[PDB]
Amino acid sequence: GAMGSMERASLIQKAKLAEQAERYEDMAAFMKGAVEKGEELSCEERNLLSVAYKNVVGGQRAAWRVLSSIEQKSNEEGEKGPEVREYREKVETELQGVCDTVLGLLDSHLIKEAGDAESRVFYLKMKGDYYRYLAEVATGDDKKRIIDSARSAYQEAMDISKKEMPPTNPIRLGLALNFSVFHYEIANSPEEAISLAKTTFDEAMADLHTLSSYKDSTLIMQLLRDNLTLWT
Amino acid sequence: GAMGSMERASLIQKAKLAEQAERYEDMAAFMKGAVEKGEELSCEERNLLSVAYKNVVGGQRAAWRVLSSIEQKSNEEGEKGPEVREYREKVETELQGVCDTVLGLLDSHLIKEAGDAESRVFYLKMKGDYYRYLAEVATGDDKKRIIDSARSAYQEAMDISKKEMPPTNPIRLGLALNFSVFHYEIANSPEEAISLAKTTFDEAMADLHTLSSYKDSTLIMQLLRDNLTLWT
C-alpha cells in the first residue's frame, strides 16, 4: 500500500492534521492505512475513521443528488444531450468505489466476533450505512442484494445493542435512527420505520433522567421526532 | 488525454455541471480538456477556467497555511516528530503540481500575441497569480526565478491594460490590486506596493461617474483601501 511503510502512530497523527486542514480524502487514506496495520482501533480512532469516510461519501452523495435532480428536470419536455447522465454516472462510480473500500475494511479488519459490544455495534452500524449508501444509487437485482445486506447488518447491530446498551446511549440511538430511515426510505417499509422510531423515542424518554452525561442523545431524539412528523 | 475523445461543447457543459455540484477538481479537468482543443476561449469560458483552478489551488493554499502555522508552533519549545513537516510537504507538492498545470496551459495554449486586449491581459494576469502562488511556498534560487517570472507577467499585463482599458474596468483593477499585493507580500517592495495602489485608487475615483455598469469595480476599490490601511 502507499501507507505500508509509515508507522501506525504517524498515520493517526497525519489523520488528525488532515482533519484540521479539512482534507478528508487524505484523512481517509491515512486512516485506512492505520486500519490495515491489523490492530483494534480505540474509540477515538474509530471516530477518526467514520468522520473521514462520512465526509468523503457525504460530498459525493450530495453531488449525485444535484445531478440526479438536474437529470429529472431535463427528463421533462426539455432539452437533450447525454452529458448530464454521463457525469452523473461518473460520480456514481466514484461513490460506489468509496463504499466498497469502506465495506472491504469493515469485513477484512474491523468486524470481529470479539471486543467491546460498543465497538461491535459501531462497525455493524457502519456496514448498514455504507450498504444503504449503495442502495441509494443501485438498481435491479443488485439493489435487492444490497438492501438485504444493509438489513442483516442493521438487525444484528440491533440485537447486540438492545441487549448490552442503555436506551439513551447515542450509538444505540443513532443506530435505530438510521435503521428506521432505511425502512422508510430504502426498503419501502413505512410501517416498520414508524414503530421502530416510536419504540425508540418512548424507551429513551422513560430514561431521560439517567443521561444527566451528554445531550448528544437529545439531538437524535429530536431527529426521531422530526422524522415521525413526516412519516405520520 | 482523458478528455481527448470528448466533444469540446460537451466538456464546457460538464464544466458547468461540475460547478453546480461543487466539483472543482472535475470542473478543472473538464476545462483543461476544453482548452486543449486548441480554440480561443470566450469571456464566459475563461471565467469557467479561472474559477475552477482558483478553487482547487485555493483549498490547497489554505491547507498549506494551516500546516505551516502548526509547523511554527511545534517549532517553538514543543514537541517533536517529522509528521507535520512531512504532510506540509505532501500538500506543497500537490499545489506546485496544479500551478505547473495552469502555467503550462497558459504558455501552451492561451497566451498569444493576438486577440482582444482584455483576453491578453486576463491570461497574463493569471500567469502572474500562479507564479505568485508558487513564490509563496518556494525557497532559494528557485524562489528568485519565480519572483522574476511573476513580475514580468504582471508588468506586461500593466503595460497592455494602462493603454487599452478605462481606469474603472475591473480586470485592470484586479490586476493592479494583485500586482501591488505581490510587491508588498512577495517581492519585499512596500514602496512600490503603496504607490501602485495609490495611483490606482485615485485614477479610478476620478472616473467613478462613468462606471454607472458594475460595482464589481467598487469592491476592489475597497480592497485597495483596506490594503493601503495596513501598508501605511
Side-chain angles (χ1 to χ4, degrees), chain A residues 3 6 9-11 13-14 17-18 20-23 25-27 29-30 59-60 62-64 66-67 70 81-84 86-87 90-91 94, chain B residues 3 6 9-11 13-14 17-18 20-23 25-27 29-30 59-60 62-64 66-67 70 81-84 86-87 90-91 94:
Chain A
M3 298 306 166
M6 198 175 317
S10 311
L11 284 165
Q13 258 180 264
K14 300 178 161 167
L17 289 171
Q20 287 158 44
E22 275 171 344
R23 302 262 302 188
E25 253 180 39
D26 289 350
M27 180 186 186
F30 293 128
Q60 288 174 330
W64 187 92
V66 172
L67 296 169
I70 289 154
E83 292 77 354
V84 24
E86 285 179 333
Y87 188 44
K90 175 177 178 150
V91 160
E94 297 197 14
Chain B
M3 298 306 166
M6 198 175 317
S10 311
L11 284 165
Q13 258 180 264
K14 300 178 161 167
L17 289 171
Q20 287 158 44
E22 275 171 344
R23 302 262 302 188
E25 253 180 39
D26 289 350
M27 180 186 186
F30 293 128
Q60 288 174 330
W64 187 92
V66 172
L67 296 169
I70 289 154
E83 292 77 354
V84 24
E86 285 179 333
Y87 188 44
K90 175 177 178 150
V91 160
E94 297 197 14

Coordinates of all heavy atoms in Angstrom, one line a residue, chain A residues 3 6 9-11 13-14 17-18 20-23 25-27 29-30 59-60 62-64 66-67 70 80-84 86-87 90-91 94, chain B residues 3 6 9-11 13-14 17-18 20-23 25-27 29-30 59-60 62-64 66-67 70 80-84 86-87 90-91 94, unseen atoms left out:
Chain A
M3 N 0.8 3.5 2.3 CA 0.8 3.8 3.7 C 1.6 2.7 4.4 O 1.7 2.7 5.7 CB -0.6 4.0 4.2 CG -1.4 5.1 3.6 SD -0.5 6.6 3.7 CE -1.4 7.7 2.6
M6 N 4.7 3.5 6.6 CA 4.6 4.5 7.6 C 4.1 3.9 8.9 O 3.3 3.0 9.0 CB 3.6 5.6 7.2 CG 3.8 6.9 8.0 SD 2.8 8.3 7.4 CE 2.9 8.1 5.6
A9 N 1.3 5.1 14.5 CA 1.2 6.3 15.3 C 1.3 7.5 14.4 O 0.6 8.5 14.6 CB 2.2 6.3 16.4
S10 N 2.2 7.5 13.4 CA 2.4 8.7 12.5 C 1.1 8.8 11.6 O 0.7 10.0 11.3 CB 3.6 8.6 11.7 OG 4.8 8.3 12.5
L11 N 0.5 7.7 11.2 CA -0.7 7.7 10.4 C -1.8 8.3 11.1 O -2.5 9.2 10.5 CB -1.0 6.2 10.0 CG -0.2 5.7 8.8 CD1 -0.3 4.2 8.8 CD2 -0.5 6.3 7.5
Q13 N -1.5 10.5 13.5 CA -1.2 11.9 13.7 C -1.6 12.7 12.4 O -2.1 13.8 12.4 CB 0.3 12.1 13.8 CG 0.8 12.4 15.2 CD 2.3 12.6 15.2 OE1 3.1 11.6 15.4 NE2 2.8 13.8 14.8
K14 N -1.2 12.1 11.2 CA -1.5 12.8 10.0 C -3.0 12.7 9.7 O -3.5 13.7 9.1 CB -0.6 12.2 8.8 CG 0.9 12.3 9.0 CD 1.6 11.7 7.8 CE 3.0 12.2 7.7 NZ 3.8 11.4 6.8
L17 N -4.0 15.8 11.5 CA -3.6 17.0 10.8 C -4.6 17.2 9.6 O -4.9 18.4 9.2 CB -2.2 16.9 10.2 CG -1.1 16.9 11.3 CD1 0.2 16.6 10.6 CD2 -1.1 18.3 11.9
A18 N -4.9 16.1 8.9 CA -5.7 16.3 7.7 C -7.1 16.8 8.0 O -7.6 17.7 7.4 CB -5.8 15.0 6.9
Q20 N -7.7 18.8 10.5 CA -7.6 20.2 10.8 C -7.4 21.0 9.5 O -7.8 22.2 9.4 CB -6.5 20.6 11.7 CG -6.7 20.2 13.1 CD -5.4 20.1 13.9 OE1 -4.5 20.9 13.7 NE2 -5.2 19.0 14.6
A21 N -6.8 20.4 8.5 CA -6.6 21.2 7.2 C -7.9 21.0 6.4 O -8.0 21.7 5.3 CB -5.4 20.7 6.5
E22 N -8.8 20.2 6.8 CA -10.1 19.8 6.1 C -9.8 19.1 4.8 O -10.2 19.5 3.7 CB -11.0 21.0 5.9 CG -11.8 21.3 7.1 CD -12.6 22.6 7.0 OE1 -12.2 23.5 6.2 OE2 -13.6 22.8 7.8
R23 N -9.0 18.0 4.9 CA -8.5 17.2 3.8 C -9.0 15.7 4.1 O -8.3 14.8 4.5 CB -7.0 17.3 3.7 CG -6.5 18.7 3.4 CD -6.3 19.1 2.0 NE -5.3 18.1 1.5 CZ -4.7 18.2 0.3 NH1 -5.0 19.3 -0.5 NH2 -3.8 17.3 -0.1
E25 N -10.3 13.3 2.1 CA -9.6 12.3 1.3 C -8.4 11.8 1.9 O -8.2 10.6 2.2 CB -9.4 12.8 -0.2 CG -10.4 12.2 -1.1 CD -10.2 12.6 -2.6 OE1 -9.0 12.8 -3.0 OE2 -11.2 12.8 -3.2
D26 N -7.5 12.7 2.2 CA -6.2 12.4 2.9 C -6.5 11.8 4.2 O -6.0 10.7 4.5 CB -5.3 13.7 3.0 CG -4.7 14.3 1.7 OD1 -4.8 13.6 0.7 OD2 -4.1 15.4 1.8
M27 N -7.4 12.4 5.0 CA -7.7 11.9 6.3 C -8.1 10.4 6.2 O -7.7 9.6 7.0 CB -8.7 12.7 7.0 CG -9.0 12.2 8.4 SD -10.4 13.2 9.1 CE -10.5 12.5 10.8
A29 N -7.5 8.2 3.6 CA -6.3 7.4 3.2 C -5.5 7.1 4.5 O -5.1 5.9 4.7 CB -5.5 7.9 2.1
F30 N -5.2 8.1 5.3 CA -4.3 7.8 6.5 C -5.0 6.9 7.4 O -4.4 5.9 8.0 CB -4.0 9.1 7.2 CG -3.1 10.1 6.5 CD1 -3.4 11.4 6.3 CD2 -1.9 9.7 5.9 CE1 -2.6 12.3 5.6 CE2 -1.0 10.5 5.3 CZ -1.4 11.9 5.1
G59 N -19.8 14.3 0.4 CA -19.7 15.2 -0.7 C -20.2 14.5 -2.0 O -20.7 15.2 -3.0
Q60 N -20.0 13.2 -2.1 CA -20.4 12.5 -3.3 C -21.9 12.3 -3.4 O -22.4 12.5 -4.5 CB -19.5 11.2 -3.4 CG -18.1 11.5 -3.7 CD -17.2 10.3 -3.7 OE1 -17.5 9.3 -3.0 NE2 -16.1 10.3 -4.5
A62 N -24.1 14.2 -2.2 CA -24.7 15.5 -2.4 C -24.5 15.9 -3.8 O -25.4 16.5 -4.4 CB -24.2 16.5 -1.4
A63 N -23.4 15.7 -4.5 CA -23.2 16.0 -5.9 C -24.1 15.0 -6.7 O -24.7 15.5 -7.7 CB -21.7 15.8 -6.3
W64 N -24.2 13.8 -6.4 CA -25.1 12.9 -7.0 C -26.5 13.4 -7.0 O -27.1 13.6 -8.1 CB -25.0 11.5 -6.4 CG -25.8 10.4 -7.1 CD1 -25.3 9.6 -8.1 CD2 -27.1 10.0 -6.9 NE1 -26.3 8.7 -8.5 CE2 -27.4 8.9 -7.8 CE3 -28.1 10.4 -6.0 CZ2 -28.6 8.3 -7.8 CZ3 -29.4 9.8 -6.1 CH2 -29.6 8.7 -7.0
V66 N -27.6 16.6 -6.6 CA -27.6 17.7 -7.5 C -27.8 17.2 -9.0 O -28.5 17.9 -9.8 CB -26.4 18.6 -7.4 CG1 -26.3 19.7 -8.5 CG2 -26.3 19.3 -6.0
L67 N -27.1 16.1 -9.3 CA -27.1 15.7 -10.7 C -28.3 14.9 -11.1 O -28.9 15.2 -12.2 CB -25.7 15.0 -11.1 CG -24.5 15.8 -10.9 CD1 -23.2 14.9 -11.0 CD2 -24.4 16.9 -11.9
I70 N -31.0 17.4 -11.6 CA -30.9 18.1 -12.9 C -31.3 17.1 -14.0 O -31.7 17.6 -15.1 CB -29.5 18.7 -13.2 CG1 -29.3 19.9 -12.2 CG2 -29.4 19.1 -14.6 CD1 -27.8 20.1 -12.0
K80 N -31.9 18.1 -24.7 CA -31.2 16.8 -24.9 C -29.7 16.9 -24.6 O -29.3 17.9 -24.0 CB -31.7 16.2 -26.2
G81 N -29.0 15.9 -25.1 CA -27.6 15.7 -24.7 C -27.4 14.7 -23.6 O -28.0 14.8 -22.5
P82 N -26.5 13.7 -23.7 CA -26.3 12.7 -22.6 C -25.3 13.2 -21.5 O -25.1 12.5 -20.6 CB -25.6 11.6 -23.4 CG -24.8 12.3 -24.5 CD -25.7 13.4 -25.0
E83 N -24.8 14.5 -21.6 CA -23.7 14.9 -20.8 C -24.1 14.7 -19.3 O -23.3 14.1 -18.5 CB -23.3 16.3 -21.1 CG -22.7 16.4 -22.5 CD -23.6 16.4 -23.7 OE1 -24.9 16.2 -23.5 OE2 -23.1 16.6 -24.8
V84 N -25.3 15.1 -18.9 CA -25.7 15.1 -17.5 C -25.8 13.6 -17.0 O -25.4 13.3 -15.9 CB -26.9 16.0 -17.2 CG1 -27.8 16.3 -18.4 CG2 -27.6 15.6 -16.0
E86 N -24.1 11.1 -18.2 CA -22.7 10.7 -18.3 C -22.0 11.1 -17.0 O -21.3 10.2 -16.3 CB -22.0 11.3 -19.5 CG -22.4 10.6 -20.8 CD -21.8 11.1 -22.1 OE1 -21.4 12.3 -22.2 OE2 -21.7 10.3 -23.0
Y87 N -22.1 12.4 -16.6 CA -21.4 12.9 -15.4 C -22.0 12.3 -14.2 O -21.2 12.0 -13.2 CB -21.4 14.4 -15.4 CG -20.5 15.0 -14.3 CD1 -19.3 14.5 -14.0 CD2 -21.0 16.1 -13.5 CE1 -18.5 15.0 -13.0 CE2 -20.2 16.6 -12.5 CZ -18.9 16.1 -12.3 OH -18.2 16.6 -11.3
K90 N -20.4 9.0 -13.8 CA -19.0 9.2 -13.3 C -19.0 9.3 -11.8 O -18.3 8.6 -11.1 CB -18.3 10.3 -14.1 CG -16.9 10.7 -13.6 CD -16.2 11.8 -14.3 CE -14.9 12.2 -13.8 NZ -14.0 12.7 -14.9
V91 N -19.9 10.1 -11.3 CA -19.9 10.4 -9.9 C -20.4 9.2 -9.1 O -19.9 8.9 -8.0 CB -20.8 11.7 -9.6 CG1 -21.2 11.8 -8.2 CG2 -20.1 12.9 -10.1
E94 N -17.5 6.8 -8.7 CA -16.7 7.1 -7.6 C -17.3 6.7 -6.2 O -16.6 6.1 -5.4 CB -16.4 8.6 -7.6 CG -15.6 9.1 -8.8 CD -14.9 10.5 -8.6 OE1 -14.9 10.9 -7.4 OE2 -14.5 11.1 -9.6
Chain B
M3 N -9.6 13.4 -21.8 CA -10.7 14.3 -22.2 C -10.6 14.4 -23.8 O -11.3 15.1 -24.4 CB -10.6 15.7 -21.6 CG -10.7 15.7 -20.1 SD -12.2 15.0 -19.6 CE -12.0 14.7 -17.8
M6 N -13.7 13.5 -26.0 CA -14.9 14.2 -25.7 C -15.1 15.5 -26.5 O -14.1 16.2 -26.7 CB -15.1 14.5 -24.2 CG -16.5 14.7 -23.8 SD -16.8 14.9 -22.1 CE -15.8 13.6 -21.4
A9 N -17.8 21.1 -26.8 CA -19.1 21.6 -26.3 C -19.5 20.8 -25.1 O -20.1 21.3 -24.1 CB -20.2 21.6 -27.3
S10 N -19.4 19.4 -25.1 CA -19.8 18.6 -24.0 C -18.9 18.9 -22.8 O -19.4 18.8 -21.7 CB -19.7 17.1 -24.4 OG -20.4 16.9 -25.6
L11 N -17.6 19.1 -23.0 CA -16.6 19.5 -22.0 C -17.0 20.7 -21.2 O -17.1 20.7 -20.0 CB -15.2 19.6 -22.5 CG -14.5 18.3 -22.9 CD1 -13.3 18.5 -23.8 CD2 -14.1 17.6 -21.6
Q13 N -20.1 21.9 -21.1 CA -21.3 21.6 -20.4 C -21.0 20.9 -19.0 O -21.6 21.2 -18.0 CB -22.2 20.6 -21.1 CG -23.3 21.1 -21.9 CD -24.1 20.0 -22.6 OE1 -23.8 19.7 -23.8 NE2 -24.9 19.3 -21.9
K14 N -20.1 19.9 -19.1 CA -19.8 19.2 -17.9 C -19.0 20.1 -16.9 O -19.1 20.0 -15.7 CB -19.1 17.9 -18.2 CG -19.9 16.9 -19.0 CD -19.1 15.6 -19.3 CE -20.0 14.5 -19.7 NZ -19.2 13.3 -20.2
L17 N -21.8 21.7 -15.1 CA -22.4 20.8 -14.1 C -21.5 20.7 -12.9 O -22.0 20.6 -11.8 CB -22.6 19.4 -14.8 CG -23.6 19.3 -15.9 CD1 -23.6 18.0 -16.6 CD2 -25.0 19.5 -15.2
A18 N -20.2 20.6 -13.1 CA -19.3 20.3 -12.0 C -19.3 21.5 -11.1 O -19.4 21.3 -9.9 CB -17.9 20.0 -12.5
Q20 N -21.9 23.4 -10.5 CA -23.1 23.3 -9.7 C -23.0 22.2 -8.7 O -23.7 22.3 -7.7 CB -24.4 23.1 -10.6 CG -24.8 24.3 -11.4 CD -25.6 23.8 -12.6 OE1 -26.5 23.0 -12.5 NE2 -25.4 24.4 -13.8
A21 N -22.3 21.1 -9.0 CA -22.2 20.1 -8.0 C -21.1 20.4 -7.0 O -21.0 19.7 -5.9 CB -22.0 18.8 -8.6
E22 N -20.4 21.5 -7.2 CA -19.2 22.0 -6.5 C -18.1 20.9 -6.5 O -17.6 20.5 -5.4 CB -19.6 22.3 -5.0 CG -20.1 23.7 -4.9 CD -20.7 24.1 -3.5 OE1 -21.1 23.1 -2.8 OE2 -20.9 25.3 -3.3
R23 N -17.7 20.6 -7.7 CA -16.6 19.6 -8.0 C -15.5 20.3 -8.8 O -15.4 20.2 -10.0 CB -17.2 18.4 -8.7 CG -18.3 17.7 -7.9 CD -17.9 16.5 -7.1 NE -17.4 15.5 -8.0 CZ -17.0 14.3 -7.7 NH1 -17.2 13.9 -6.5 NH2 -16.5 13.5 -8.6
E25 N -12.2 20.1 -8.8 CA -11.2 19.2 -9.5 C -11.8 18.8 -10.9 O -11.1 19.0 -11.9 CB -10.9 18.0 -8.6 CG -9.5 18.2 -8.0 CD -9.1 17.0 -7.1 OE1 -9.5 15.8 -7.5 OE2 -8.5 17.2 -6.1
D26 N -13.0 18.3 -10.9 CA -13.7 17.8 -12.1 C -13.8 19.0 -13.0 O -13.4 19.0 -14.2 CB -15.0 17.1 -11.8 CG -15.0 15.8 -11.1 OD1 -13.8 15.2 -11.0 OD2 -16.0 15.3 -10.7
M27 N -14.3 20.1 -12.4 CA -14.6 21.3 -13.3 C -13.3 21.7 -14.0 O -13.3 22.0 -15.2 CB -15.1 22.5 -12.5 CG -15.4 23.7 -13.3 SD -15.9 25.1 -12.2 CE -16.4 26.3 -13.4
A29 N -10.5 19.7 -14.6 CA -10.1 18.8 -15.6 C -10.9 19.0 -16.9 O -10.3 19.0 -18.0 CB -10.2 17.4 -15.1
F30 N -12.3 19.2 -16.8 CA -13.1 19.5 -18.0 C -12.6 20.7 -18.7 O -12.5 20.7 -19.9 CB -14.6 19.6 -17.6 CG -15.2 18.3 -17.1 CD1 -15.9 18.3 -15.9 CD2 -15.1 17.1 -17.8 CE1 -16.5 17.1 -15.5 CE2 -15.7 15.9 -17.4 CZ -16.4 15.9 -16.2
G59 N -8.1 25.8 -2.0 CA -8.2 24.9 -0.9 C -6.8 24.4 -0.5 O -6.5 24.1 0.7
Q60 N -5.8 24.4 -1.5 CA -4.5 23.9 -1.2 C -3.7 24.9 -0.4 O -3.0 24.5 0.6 CB -3.8 23.3 -2.5 CG -4.5 22.1 -3.0 CD -3.9 21.6 -4.3 OE1 -3.5 22.4 -5.1 NE2 -4.0 20.3 -4.5
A62 N -4.8 27.1 1.5 CA -5.4 27.3 2.8 C -5.0 26.1 3.7 O -4.8 26.4 4.9 CB -6.9 27.5 2.7
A63 N -4.9 24.9 3.2 CA -4.4 23.8 4.0 C -2.9 23.9 4.2 O -2.5 23.7 5.4 CB -4.7 22.5 3.3
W64 N -2.2 24.4 3.3 CA -0.8 24.7 3.4 C -0.6 25.7 4.6 O 0.1 25.4 5.6 CB -0.2 25.3 2.1 CG 1.3 25.5 2.2 CD1 2.3 24.6 1.8 CD2 2.1 26.6 2.6 NE1 3.5 25.1 2.0 CE2 3.4 26.4 2.4 CE3 1.7 27.9 3.0 CZ2 4.4 27.3 2.7 CZ3 2.7 28.8 3.3 CH2 4.0 28.5 3.1
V66 N -2.7 26.4 7.2 CA -3.0 25.7 8.4 C -1.7 24.9 8.9 O -1.5 24.7 10.1 CB -4.2 24.8 8.3 CG1 -4.3 23.8 9.5 CG2 -5.5 25.5 8.0
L67 N -1.0 24.3 7.9 CA 0.0 23.3 8.3 C 1.3 24.0 8.6 O 1.9 23.7 9.6 CB 0.2 22.2 7.2 CG -1.0 21.3 6.9 CD1 -0.8 20.5 5.7 CD2 -1.3 20.4 8.1
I70 N 0.9 25.3 12.0 CA 1.1 24.3 13.0 C 2.6 24.0 13.2 O 3.0 23.5 14.2 CB 0.2 23.1 12.8 CG1 -1.2 23.4 13.1 CG2 0.7 21.9 13.7 CD1 -2.1 22.5 12.3
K80 N 8.1 17.1 19.3 CA 8.8 16.6 18.1 C 8.0 15.7 17.2 O 6.7 15.6 17.3 CB 10.2 16.1 18.5
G81 N 8.7 14.9 16.3 CA 8.1 14.2 15.2 C 8.1 14.9 13.9 O 7.7 16.1 13.8
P82 N 8.5 14.3 12.8 CA 8.5 15.0 11.5 C 7.2 15.0 10.8 O 7.1 15.5 9.7 CB 9.5 14.1 10.7 CG 9.3 12.7 11.3 CD 9.1 12.9 12.7
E83 N 6.1 14.5 11.4 CA 4.9 14.2 10.6 C 4.3 15.5 10.0 O 4.0 15.5 8.8 CB 3.8 13.5 11.5 CG 4.3 12.1 11.9 CD 5.3 12.0 13.0 OE1 5.9 13.0 13.5 OE2 5.6 10.8 13.4
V84 N 4.4 16.5 10.8 CA 3.7 17.8 10.3 C 4.5 18.4 9.2 O 4.0 18.8 8.2 CB 3.4 18.7 11.4 CG1 4.2 18.6 12.7 CG2 3.3 20.2 11.0
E86 N 6.3 16.6 7.1 CA 6.1 15.6 6.0 C 4.8 15.9 5.3 O 4.8 16.0 4.0 CB 6.1 14.2 6.6 CG 7.5 13.7 7.0 CD 7.6 12.3 7.6 OE1 6.6 11.9 8.3 OE2 8.6 11.7 7.5
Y87 N 3.7 16.1 6.0 CA 2.4 16.4 5.5 C 2.4 17.7 4.8 O 1.8 17.8 3.7 CB 1.3 16.2 6.5 CG -0.1 16.2 5.8 CD1 -0.4 15.6 4.7 CD2 -1.1 16.9 6.4 CE1 -1.7 15.6 4.1 CE2 -2.4 17.0 5.9 CZ -2.7 16.3 4.7 OH -3.9 16.4 4.2
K90 N 3.9 17.1 1.5 CA 3.0 16.5 0.6 C 2.0 17.5 -0.1 O 1.8 17.5 -1.3 CB 2.2 15.3 1.3 CG 1.1 14.6 0.5 CD 0.5 13.5 1.3 CE -0.7 12.8 0.5 NZ -0.8 11.3 0.9
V91 N 1.5 18.4 0.8 CA 0.5 19.3 0.3 C 1.1 20.4 -0.6 O 0.5 20.7 -1.6 CB -0.2 20.0 1.5 CG1 -0.9 21.3 1.1 CG2 -1.2 19.0 2.2
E94 N 1.5 18.8 -4.1 CA 0.3 18.9 -4.9 C 0.1 20.3 -5.5 O -0.2 20.5 -6.6 CB -0.9 18.5 -4.0 CG -0.9 17.1 -3.6 CD -2.3 16.6 -3.1 OE1 -3.3 17.3 -3.4 OE2 -2.3 15.5 -2.4

